[PDB]
Amino acid sequence: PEIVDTCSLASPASVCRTKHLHLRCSVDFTRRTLTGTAALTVQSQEDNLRSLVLDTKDLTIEKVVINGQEVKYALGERQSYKGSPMEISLPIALSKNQEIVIEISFETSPKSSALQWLTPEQTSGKEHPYLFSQCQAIHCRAILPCQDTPSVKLTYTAEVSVPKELVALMSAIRDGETPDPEDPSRKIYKFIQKVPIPCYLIALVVGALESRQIGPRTLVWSEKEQVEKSAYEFSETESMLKIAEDLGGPYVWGQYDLLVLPPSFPYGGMENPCLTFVTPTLLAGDKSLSNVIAHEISHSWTGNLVTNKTWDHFWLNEGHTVYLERHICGRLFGEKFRHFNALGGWGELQNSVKTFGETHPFTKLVVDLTDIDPNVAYSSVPYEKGFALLFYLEQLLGGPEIFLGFLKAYVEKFSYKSITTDDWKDFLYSYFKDKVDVLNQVDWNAWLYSPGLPPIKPNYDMTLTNACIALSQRWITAKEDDLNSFNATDLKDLSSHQLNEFLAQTLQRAPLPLGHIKRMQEVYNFNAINNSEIRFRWLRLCIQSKWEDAIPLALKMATEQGRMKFTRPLFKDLAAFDKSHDQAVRTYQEHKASMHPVTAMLVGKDLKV
Ligand SMILES: [Zn+2]
Numbered sequence: 178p179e180i181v182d183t184c185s186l187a188s189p190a191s192v193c194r195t196k197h198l199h200l201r202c203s204v205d206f207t208r209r210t211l212t213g214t215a216a217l218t219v220q221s222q223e224d225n226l227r228s229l230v231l232d233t234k235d236l237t238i239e240k241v242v243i244n245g246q247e248v249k250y251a252l253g254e255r256q257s258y259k260g261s262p263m264e265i266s267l268p269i270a271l272s273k274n275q276e277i278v279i280e281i282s283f284e285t286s287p288k289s290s291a292l293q294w295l296t297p298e299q300t301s302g303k304e305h306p307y308l309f310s311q312c313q314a315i316h317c318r319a320i321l322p323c324q325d326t327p328s329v330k331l332t333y334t335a336e337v338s339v340p341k342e343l344v345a346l347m348s349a350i351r352d353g354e355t356p357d358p359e360d361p362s363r364k365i366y367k368f369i370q371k372v373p374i375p376c377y378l379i380a381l382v383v384g385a386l387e388s389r390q391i392g393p394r395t396l397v398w399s400e401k402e403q404v405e406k407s408a409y410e411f412s413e414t415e416s417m418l419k420i421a422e423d424l425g426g427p428y429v430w431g432q433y434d435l436l437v438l439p440p441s442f443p444y445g446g447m448e449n450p451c452l453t454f455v456t457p458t459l460l461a462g463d464k465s466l467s468n469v470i471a472h473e474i475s476h477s478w479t480g481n482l483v484t485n486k487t488w489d490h491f492w493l494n495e496g497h498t499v500y501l502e503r504h505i506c507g508r509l510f511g512e513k514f515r516h517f518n519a520l521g522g523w524g525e526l527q528n529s530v531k532t533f534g535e536t537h538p539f540t541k542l543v544v545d546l547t548d549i550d551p552n553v554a555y556s557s558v559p560y561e562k563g564f565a566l567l568f569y570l571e572q573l574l575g576g577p578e579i580f581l582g583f584l585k586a587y588v589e590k591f592s593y594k595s596i597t598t599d600d601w602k603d604f605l606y607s608y609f610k611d612k613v614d615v616l617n618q619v620d621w622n623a624w625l626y627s628p629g630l631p632p633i634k635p636n637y638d639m640t641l642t643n644a645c646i647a648l649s650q651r652w653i654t655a656k657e658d659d660l661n662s663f664n665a666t667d668l669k670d671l672s673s674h675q676l677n678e679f680l681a682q683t684l685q686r687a688p689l690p691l692g693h694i695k696r697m698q699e700v701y702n703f704n705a706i707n708n709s710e711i712r713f714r715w716l717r718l719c720i721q722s723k724w725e726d727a728i729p730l731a732l733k734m735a736t737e738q739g740r741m742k743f744t745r746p747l748f749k750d751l752a753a754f755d756k757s758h759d760q761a762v763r764t765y766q767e768h769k770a771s772m773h774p775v776t777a778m779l780v781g782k783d784l785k786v
Pocket of ligand 1: 495498
């Protein structure tokens with residue numbers, strides 16, 4: 178049979194497809210285990226199907242029951258990061274389209290790569306522990322046995338037993354709570370996901386969670402320490418959803434809840450269906466970062482509804498998501514702003530290609546992950562090279578309203594399906610058959626299969642960017658004789674996004690003489706800004722130019738939150754600044770117990786402890 182996805186060891190979708198999962202499990206914080214049963218409804222695509230294979234990783238299997246009787250099963254040899262295949266002998270031979278229910282009793286490993294267990298000290302509230310999953314790309318197989326490939330999409334229902342003081346949430350619609358009948362110290366939370374999803378979008382959180390309703394289809398959830406601030410910061414979520422619906426078609430998932438993770442959370446957002454994960458570093462206080470969740474909102478069409486069939490084609494997901502997201506922001510702030518964000522994106526692609534090297538296989542849009550762990554293959558290239566291809570095509574084919582018609586038709590065509598780059602390109606050619614002569618001038622080989630920068634750069638409106646450049650080239654090429662020439666007015670017409678962009682361009686040419694940065698503080702007072710993006714780049718600029726006043730401010734930001742994007746480079750700068758190195762090592766030791774274990778480990782490695 179045709180093998181779809183080489184990152185999966187399970188029977189491929191051409192042989193059988195999982196249609197539904199019923200998960201009944203219990204979360205044990207003492208053992209750091211999930212225990213229970215996974216009932217998979219599986220549909221055969223062949224005749225005479227007598228066995229099938231599932232992905233697993235570090236699972237303990239107690240038994241497999243089919244039609245009331247335990248069945249034989251065998252775990253195969255482990256294949257590195259893919260885990261161990263689990264072969265199940267069926268009690269009957271299945272015919273094409275025939276279905277069977279397979280109930281696997283399992284327990285996860287405390288070292289499960291999919292499950293992040295936090296100690297009380299690593300939470301906001303400091304009393305209760307906390308659990309969150311992170312299945313993308315191929316970690317769902319370390320939670321339960323499955324066809325762990327986005328080429329298969331299933332619905333699911335779940336029942337999750339947790340200590341009664343805690344709350345469970347999942348990538349699904351909440352479906353009620355009851356006391357656990359087998360244990361009065363525990364509650365059972367139920368969930369239902371009626372839209373078929375790839376299993377990497379199965380997600381679970383258990384913790385001391387509270388909610389605020391902020392829209393007809395939106396609750397925000399967090400620990401009590403963050404929930405009120407979060408309800409304000411993200412109060413415009415519903416208006417963003419309505420904009421996304423206008424751009425991409427109906428939102429099919431029912432609810433759109435938000436979860437603001439604990440400060441120790443080392444990552445960015447995650448587009449879990451019905452429950453977007455939000456990093457708390459977006460809590461700027463002025464909503465200047467609230468539009469960032471337009472990324473996860475957009476995945477509800479591009480990635481979650483139309484999905485990449487394998488991880489080689491992940492750019493189809495991220496690329497179309499960034500394209501939709503930049504349209505949401507264009508609706509909110511204007512077309513000039515969409516071009517501002519697009520041009521910044523091109524800059525990030527330049528940096529990514531330079532970091533990897535322009536011949537590196539990961540700077541291709543379509544990547545071959547045959548012998549590469551997809552869990553460690555993420556970069557900005559699918560995001561920004563994919564966006565650039567779509568923005569180039571938009572300009573080639575008659576502009577944004579016309580290409581937005583293509584986007585809507587593409588979503589409608591492939592909703593609830595999983596597709597490859599060739600499926601996408603075939604549909605592009607079909608939709609734009611009236612313009613094939615134009616499409617045939619595109620260097621598809623270069624764009625899709627070649628490393629490095631794209632062969633053509635799109636046309637970017639420069640209005641909002643030129644402002645930041647103008648001021649950037651003024652500070653750098655200045656002497657002590659000119660520092661008095663700066664004043665607050667220099668920032669009068671610059672948005673928070675433009676402030677961020679100015680600091681980005683200024684940091685890129687660090688160090689600045691101390692007189693300049695001292696002046697820059699005197700007139701601009703960047704010490705006062707709380708926007709995590711702005712505060713980050715500013716503090717790096719101060720340390721990399723050896724200002725004493727900045728040492729305590731950077732140490733504070735580096736330990737108050739654990740997002741790797743900020744915490745790691747800050748400790749790197751503080752370690753590299755000889756004046757602060759000793760203090761940076763000492764502060765790390767004092768706070769490392771409250772960090773996420775992976776942040777604690779990598780900063781320790783950087784600090785050479
Ligand atoms: Zn994304």
